[PDB]
């Protein structure tokens, strides 16, 4: 198991514009297109992202291409972030995958907001951090995915995904 396979299980794959759990226009493997309500605004962003007139539909290769960019951007954002970097640096390889997953789903700003849990992860207080991560809107909104991520943090293994 690796970050790519982990996120592909959590996000799924869709080749037609769809609405995410929050109601926003998304395509492929969790690629947010726009927070705007306009499907047109969404198709426009889509075409811009792909470099062609897509009429709202893309191929597998195109979806994967967006996915590769997004994982890269996620990693590079963590490493550029003063609040996140030290956390990431302190973690083992499995837990680093779990942190990237959060960042991909909620943005750098969002994760940077989990101040208390970050301090706990850095100190390697796994159980306590797992309890604190659960007290969040994130966990209440997408409980199955949150539990998987949290278990990865608590255990340091890929069990939740196996
Ligand atoms: Cl893009
Ligand atoms: Cl869920």
Curated annotation (Swiss-Prot):
Changing residue 11 to Q: Complete loss of activity. Changing residue 26 to E: Complete loss of activity at neutral pH; covalently bound substrate. Substrate binds at residues 32, 104, 117, 132. Induction: Expressed late in the viral replication. GO terms for biological process: cell wall macromolecule catabolic process; defense response to bacterium; peptidoglycan catabolic process; viral release from host cell by cytolysis. CDD domains: T4-like_lys. Optimum pH is 7.3. InterPro entries: Endolysin_T4_type, Glyco_hydro_24, Lysozyme-like_dom_sf, Lysozyme_dom_sf, Phage_lysozyme-like, T4-type_lysozyme. GO terms for molecular function: lysozyme activity. The active site is at 11 (proton donor/acceptor), 20 (proton donor/acceptor). Its main location: host cell. Changing residue 117 to F: 10-fold decrease in enzymatic activity. Changing residue 117 to V: 50-fold decrease in enzymatic activity. It comes from the Viruses. Its EC number is 3.2.1.17. One of its GO terms (cellular component) is host cell cytoplasm. It is found in: Host cytoplasm. Endolysin with lysozyme activity that degrades host peptidoglycans and participates with the holin and spanin proteins in the sequential events which lead to the programmed host cell lysis releasing the mature viral particles. Once the holin has permeabilized the host cell membrane, the endolysin can reach the periplasm and break down the peptidoglycan layer. This is Endolysin. It comes from Enterobacteria phage T4 (Bacteriophage T4).
